[PDB]
Amino acid sequence: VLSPADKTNVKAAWGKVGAHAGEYGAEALERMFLSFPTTKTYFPHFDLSHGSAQVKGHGKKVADALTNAVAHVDDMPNALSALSDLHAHKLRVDPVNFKLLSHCLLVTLAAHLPAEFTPAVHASLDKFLASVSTVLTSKYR
Amino acid sequence: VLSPADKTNVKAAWGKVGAHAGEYGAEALERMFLSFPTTKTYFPHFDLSHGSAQVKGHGKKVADALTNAVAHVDDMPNALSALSDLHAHKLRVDPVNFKLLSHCLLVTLAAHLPAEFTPAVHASLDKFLASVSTVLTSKYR
Amino acid sequence: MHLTPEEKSAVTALWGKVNVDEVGGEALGRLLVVYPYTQRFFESFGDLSTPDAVMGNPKVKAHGKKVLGAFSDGLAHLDNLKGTFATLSELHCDKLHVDPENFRLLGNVLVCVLAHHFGKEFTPPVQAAYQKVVAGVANALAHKYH
Amino acid sequence: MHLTPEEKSAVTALWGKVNVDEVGGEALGRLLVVYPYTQRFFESFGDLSTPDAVMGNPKVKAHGKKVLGAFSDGLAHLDNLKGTFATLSELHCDKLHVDPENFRLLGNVLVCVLAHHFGKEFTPPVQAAYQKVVAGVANALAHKYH
Ligand code: HEM
Ligand code: HEM
Ligand code: HEM
Ligand code: HEM
Incomplete structure (x- = not known):
């Protein structure tokens, strides 16, 4: 449960990220793939090599959702709804992976x-990512 | 998210436990201590020997809390307010442990x-035990 | 494996009473029902839209028989799980792309099935030995991932 | 826990620039701040109610030093983590009653602290190598639990 202090912290840190969001995004994915190889089982269709455009592209999408999530911190459920749908009904990533990516984003930051x-x-950031994670797997079953 | 079907399933199942609830809770605990020995680190003050009076006692208490949770499925945060507090501010049991006990409760059942x-x-029961767990650790941070 | 001799026997003794046919299918069908996200690997099995559709799907049952026969084989080698499952580990990583977390899910569902199937005979200590075995099999199957 | 020759080098080189003291107090304090439930073990340290309180506590600083000191000695024996940590493992279990899950949390927080400290030199590959080490260590320390 995010306190006002938390929300304040997040808005602030994500603020400094700014324009670099997408770069950090791709950095985080790379750290994940290297540190926790099992996560690569979800991207068999990806060029997972260093600087792959696929990874750069994916990382931008991921940063964009996060930016969207900070903007609507008070209503993530609705703001992230299509994404929770996609994760629950299509991607179906086991929930432990969210904790792996969240760790690698903190490392990046x-x-x-x-x-x-x-x-x-x-x-604050740890708690924020845990909340985004809860939203994303909220419709699993 | 417990659907109406989940709630009926749980009430049914738990209705059947009836009077054996404390006996099943003690058994669940014993099952947890034997299969996942790290959970014993929270009960250094307990005699964990088979049939121990502390285990039996504790078992009934867990069982009663569950019974209450089933009776208040639609109002869990409020029904388990006292436990959420206790676990969050005193006991401070790492959240993974909840997953171990839920498993042992399902095996007993x-x-x-x-x-x-x-x-x-x-x-339905698996989804119910994860919900109870979520309420109990909701005030951790 | 890291099971006491008493545990090793307990495991074997119970396993002898298991109908691998029946139990495999129940174990994989319940994985698919309780953890629906796991359906992601089986789109080619057809309809898994409901509990009933899952439980009675013959591909489900046949695959379950297969999984459980491989499981049974490792029981004959508690000492070299790594060795019994190296090939299967490579296959699951390289060819199937299965996140190994799924092996752990399946291990707990199987524990639940044995308990349901055996009742009171599935005592705390027997479950404990079985917990050691399912953990041992998931690690051996995760071993060749990269 | 298999470090390629290059990973070993990477681990070693960075570690020679680490001020244990400083890093130890920072890793332990962050733990206490991000996962407040971990304060359950340090009631005698005093008031750990605010980040400022935690970070400036001298008991937290001293402890962080002790812990990372031991950590640092293990880096000297990556080939036998288990034997090296056996006694501490038995101590944590029988005397301290510390859920081994905390060793995993501390390892992740430690990685966060080295990235914070070193910035850009803490590259994906270096992190991967440290990830292997903190898991190895957590596993060595959980090894003697029963
Ligand atoms: C903070 C958590 C996460 C966020 C914000 C996030 C966000 C997204 C977004 C925005 C997309 C693309 C949607 C589209 O293009 O239509 C996506 C797709 C995807 N996500 Fe998630 N995701 C998260 C966690 C994860 C995790 C932990 C994994 C697995 C390790 C994962 C696996 C995938 C995959 C495999 C795709 C499809 C990529 C493709 O084939 O193009 N995601 N995610
Ligand atoms: C199903 C989830 C759980 C429920 C419903 C539950 C319920 C309870 C209840 C009703 C009490 C007694 C409160 C009182 O003393 O009046 C309690 C205390 C306690 N619980 Fe939880 N608990 C759960 C999970 C856990 C887990 C997973 C652990 C650790 C592995 C744990 C560790 C403890 C401890 C150490 C105490 C204090 C025991 C004593 O000293 O008497 N609980 N719990
Ligand atoms: C005890 C754990 C497991 C064992 C021993 C096991 C064993 C096997 C074996 C022997 C095969 C067929 C090998 C061959 O083609 O020669 C197989 C295939 C497969 N397994 Fe596993 N498995 C296990 C767990 C899982 C889990 C949990 C999943 C996913 C939830 C999974 C997904 C698959 C898939 C998708 C196939 C291919 C089916 C096909 O041929 O179309 N396995 N498994
Ligand atoms: C990298 C993992 C760790 C290492 C190498 C480590 C090492 C140590 C050492 C060397 C001691 C002193 C023991 C002695 O007197 O011989 C100690 C004590 C202690 N450790 Fe661990 N520790 C680790 C992680 C943790 C964590 C994560 C916790 C709790 C979150 C913890 C809780 C304690 C406590 C409560 C004490 C006793 C403090 C005192 O009596 O002043 N340790 N640890």
Whole structure:
């Protein structure tokens, strides 16, 4: 459950990400694929090599949804509805993977926002990603 | 999300447990301690020997909480307010443990409800135990 | 495996009473019902739209027999699961693209099926040994992933 | 836990620039902040109610030092993590009663802290290599639980 403080933290950190969102997105995916190889089982149709355009492209979509999620932090369920549909009915990614990607996004953020990645913001971001994750797998069964 | 069908399935199943609830809760715990030994780290003050008085006691308490949860399926956050608090601020049991106990509860039920434990009821009960777990750890952070 | 000699016997003794035909199909059908997202691997099996459609789908049952026969084979080699399943591990990664988390899901469903099937005979200690075996089989099957 | 020769180098090189003290206190404090339930073990440290409170607590700093000191010694023996951590493993279980899940959380927070600290040098491949190490260590420390 995001407090006002959390929402404040997130808006702030995502703010500094800004224009770089999509790059971080693709960075995070790469860190994931390398760190947790099992996640590659979901992208057999992808060129998973370094700088693959597919990964760059995918990473942009993922950053865009997150931006959309920060903008509607107070109504993620509705703001992310088509995406929760897609995940629940089409992609059907086992829920443990969300925790793997969330970890790699924090890693990305930490490595790019030294001044901004304080303990309190880290804590907020962790909670935010967990919430997006809950929304995305909310329609599994 | 518990649908009307899930709720009927749970009430039915649990109606059948009836008076054996405390006996099943003790059994579920014993099953958890034996299969997932790391769960014993939360009960260093308990005699975990078979048939121990602390296990039996605790077993009835868990069972009663579930009974209550079934009686208030439509109002769980409110019904389990006291437990959510207790777990979040005192006990502080890592959330993975909830998944272990739910599994052992389902196994106990399966071993005792030959007729009722159909795939549909099994799915309903699994969804119910995950909901209870979610309420109990909802105030963690 | 990392099972005591008492556990090893308990496992074997019970397994002898299992109808691999029947149990495989129930175990894979219940995986598909309880964890519907798992249906993702079986679009070619036809209709899995409802509990009943899943439970009575013959491809479900036949595949279950197959899975459980492979499972049964590793029981004869508790000591070299890694070895008994290396080929199957490679196949599941390289050819099928199955996230190994699914192996763990299936292991817990099977535990539930055995309990349902055996009742009181499936005691806490027997389940505990079976938990060790299903964990052992999921790890062996995840072993060649990369 | 298989580190290729290059992973080993990467791990080693970065670790030679780490100030255990500093990093230890930071990793332990972040743990306490992001996953507050982990404070259940450190009631005697005092007030851990605010991030500021946690991060500036000297007991948290000293403990972080102790923990990462041991961590650091294990890096010297990546070939025998199990034997190296056997005694600490038995201690955590029998005396401290620490759910081994916390070792996984601390490992992930540690990775976050090295990325924070090193920035761009903490590349995907370096992270992958550290991911293998923190899992190896968590597994070594959970090994003697019963
Ligand atoms: C923060 C969590 C996540 C977000 C915001 C997210 C967002 C998205 C978006 C926006 C799309 C594309 C929709 C479209 O183009 O129509 C997508 C597709 C996809 N996602 Fe998720 N996703 C998340 C987590 C995951 C995880 C953890 C995995 C698996 C490891 C995953 C696997 C996929 C796959 C395989 C696709 C389809 C890609 C393609 O074939 O083009 N996603 N996701
Ligand atoms: C199905 C989910 C659970 C329910 C419904 C539940 C319910 C309860 C209840 C009713 C109590 C007693 C409150 C009182 O003393 O009045 C309690 C206490 C406790 N629970 Fe939970 N619990 C659940 C999960 C867990 C798990 C998974 C663990 C750890 C593995 C756990 C560890 C404890 C401990 C250590 C206590 C205190 C025991 C004592 O010292 O008497 N609980 N729980
Ligand atoms: C005890 C765990 C498992 C064992 C021992 C097992 C074993 C097997 C075997 C022996 C085959 C056929 C090999 C061949 O083609 O020669 C197979 C195929 C397959 N398995 Fe697994 N399996 C297990 C778990 C799973 C799970 C949990 C899933 C997904 C939920 C899965 C998905 C598949 C698929 C999609 C196929 C191919 C079916 C076809 O031939 O069309 N398996 N499995
Ligand atoms: C990388 C993993 C870890 C290592 C290498 C480690 C190492 C240590 C060491 C060397 C000690 C001192 C033991 C002695 O007196 O000989 C210790 C104590 C302790 N550790 Fe662990 N630790 C780890 C993770 C954790 C975590 C994650 C927790 C809880 C979240 C924890 C809880 C404790 C506690 C409560 C003590 C006793 C503190 C005291 O008495 O002052 N440890 N640990």
